[PDB]
Design a protein around this ligand. Structure first.
Ligand code: HEM
Ligand code: C0R
Length: 386
């Protein structure tokens, strides 16, 4: 067993491992775990040693996307989309984000008790991402189900359990792919002000990319639009409700909201760990990793490392410095980080401004997402207390 509460609070385990053997082979899971900050940093910076190429027996469109390719192909692909996602590119989206936020809040103005997740932190980012891709938000419910399947972790360690899930992932990949091949066809005919059109335009003009590659990137963004920022927002609310002294201070000092969001990214990171494959034999903190072995750098553990974060187990909305790796580190550093920060800020500032006396509803229950790829809650019932 591990109860819900232990699953959502892995930090005692991380600490134990950090202070004994921060690099260690786990026989059961067949991976090298990496728990200390310097190890996580080294694994993620050393792109030519710790590969992001995840080989399966048929590769997917997702397997050709940015997150799963090594240099020199990675730099070429990322080059085609970088300009579209800079901080300054994304400041253009602020007034859109603020309107979606207000529209969502208006829709539940009549409820005294609301689910932060279902009504606010989940819809806002998929509505943004559907506008960015140029796909219809009327398909939101398919998007969510496909995306939850893809990031889903198994309920047990049994094999008829894992193999059923693998199957359900392959089926979701297929349907996602065929969805986006249709979209592509539609856009070749009727382009729009979206990034699928923009990549088709770059393709017609002779940039080196396949239609499968456009599908793969579109899927990556879709899943990102369903499965990351939602948890940053919800987890922030969770942290502020857990520690009311932080919440009371934030309300007095609004300018601390960005710093507080960075301290959620550290303290309750939406992504706890990543995966790499050893390309060639390497020693990492005195351990000898072999070609072809898998490695799991735990950013969630690194973020609690005392050598880099004074009083690590303490949530400090004003924490400085805060050099966390919640978006990764190195060439695969999250493309969406500017968007995620601005979505989170705008939504959280408005929530806090409207409901300063908010607290857990009598119906609240801790329900962690069953996933190793994402870290968050499935629901978060709050009472407004107006
Ligand atoms: C708080 C929200 C988010 C968190 C915590 C997060 C986390 C991450 C992390 C840790 C990586 C590194 C992957 C690796 O090294 O293997 C990553 C990559 C990536 N993320 Fe995010 N993400 C978030 C939101 C977003 C959003 C909204 C987008 C949508 C544009 C996005 C798009 C991407 C892409 C396209 C990559 C691959 C970049 C590359 O390989 O060059 N992320 N993200
Ligand atoms: C889950 C995967 C890794 C990781 O989880 C991805 C996810 C797609 C959505 C996404 C957007 C981000 O900004 C952070 C990581 C992440 C949330 C990917 C879908 C297939 C991939 C794998 O399954 C590799 O095994």
């Amino acid at each position: 067993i591990q109860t819900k509460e232990e699953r959502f609070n892995p930090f005692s385990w991380y600490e134990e491992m950090r202070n004994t053997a921060p690099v260690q082979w786990d026989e059961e899971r067949q991976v090298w775990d990496v728990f200390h900050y310097d190890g996580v940093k080294e694994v993620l910076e050393q792109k030519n040693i710790f590969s992001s190429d995840r080989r399966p027996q048929r590769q997917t469109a997702l397997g050709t996307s940015l997150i799963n390719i090594d240099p020199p192909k990675h730099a070429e692909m990322r080059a085609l989309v970088n300009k579209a996602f800079t901080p300054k590119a994304m400041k253009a989206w602020e007034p859109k984000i603020a309107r979606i936020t207000n529209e969502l809040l208006q829709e539940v103005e009549h409820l005294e008790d609301i689910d932060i997740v279902e009504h606010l932190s989940y819809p806002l980012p998929v509505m943004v991402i559907a506008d960015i891709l140029g796909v219809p938000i009327e398909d939101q419910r398919q998007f969510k189900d496909w995306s939850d399947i893809i990031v889903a972790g198994p309920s047990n360690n049994e094999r008829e359990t894992l193999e059923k899930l693998q199957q359900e992932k392959m089926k979701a990949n297929d349907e996602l792919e065929t969805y986006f091949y249709r979209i592509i066809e539609e856009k070749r005919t009727r382009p729009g002000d979206d990034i699928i059109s923009v990549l088709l335009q770059a393709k017609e003009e002779g940039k080196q990319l396949t239609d499968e590659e456009i599908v793969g990137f579109s899927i990556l963004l879709l899943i990102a639009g369903n499965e990351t920022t939602t948890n940053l927002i919800s987890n922030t609310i969770y942290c502020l409700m857990e520690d009311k002294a932080s919440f009371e201070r934030l309300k007095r000092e609004k300018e601390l909201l960005p710093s507080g969001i960075e301290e959620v990214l550290r303290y309750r990171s939406p992504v706890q760990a990543l995966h790499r494959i050893v390309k060639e034999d390497v020693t990492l903190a005195g351990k000898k990793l072999k070609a072809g072995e898998h490695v799991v750098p735990w950013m969630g553990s690194a973020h609690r490392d005392a050598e880099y974060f004074e009083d690590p187990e303490v949530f400090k909305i004003d924490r400085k410095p805060n050099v966390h790796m919640a978006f990764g580190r190195g060439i695969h550093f999250c493309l969406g980080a500017p968007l995620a920060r601005i979505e989170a800020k705008i939504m959280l500032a408005e929530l806090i401004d409207r409901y300063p006396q908010m607290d857990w509803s009598p119906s609240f229950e801790l329900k962690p997402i069953e996933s190793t790829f994402v870290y968050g809650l499935k629901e978060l019932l709050i009472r407004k207390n107006v």
